[PDB]
Design an enzyme around this catalytic site. Sequence first.
Site, PDB file in Angstrom:
ATOM      1  N   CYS A  30       0.500  -1.308  -0.521  1.00  0.00           N
ATOM      2  CA  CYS A  30       0.051   0.121  -0.014  1.00  0.00           C
ATOM      3  C   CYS A  30       0.711   1.329   0.128  1.00  0.00           C
ATOM      4  CB  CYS A  30      -0.791  -0.141   1.194  1.00  0.00           C
ATOM      5  SG  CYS A  30      -2.278   1.042   0.890  1.00  0.00           S
ATOM      6  N   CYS A  33       0.391   3.918   3.027  1.00  0.00           N
ATOM      7  CA  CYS A  33       0.794   3.769   4.368  1.00  0.00           C
ATOM      8  C   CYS A  33       2.656   4.026   3.939  1.00  0.00           C
ATOM      9  CB  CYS A  33       1.273   1.587   4.200  1.00  0.00           C
ATOM     10  SG  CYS A  33      -1.130   2.248   4.502  1.00  0.00           S
TER      11      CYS A  33
END
Length: 105
Positions: A30, A33
């Site tokens: 991700c 993230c």
Amino acid sequence: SVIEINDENFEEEVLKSDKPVLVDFWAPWCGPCRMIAPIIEELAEEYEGKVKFAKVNVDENPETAAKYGIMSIPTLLLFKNGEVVDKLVGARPKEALKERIEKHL
């Protein structure tokens, strides 16, 4: 500092913590993230001793994800006294997180 926690120690480290805990639910794939990670790092230094910062990799910890209905990441849950007291879905700036943390000190 930030701590990596998992299905096994979550209860003891987060729910039984004597201070607020910000938990960052993330995963290696991700991108956003990766964007908030240095922010979580900055905050942990600024709030050393007052707030605890934890990361849970949802790819390795399904039980903990499920237990809080984590379906999108990043998601940041703020816990105090065993309870979720704030929830942020999606990357956000440092100031957005600081504000929510400050409300619970």
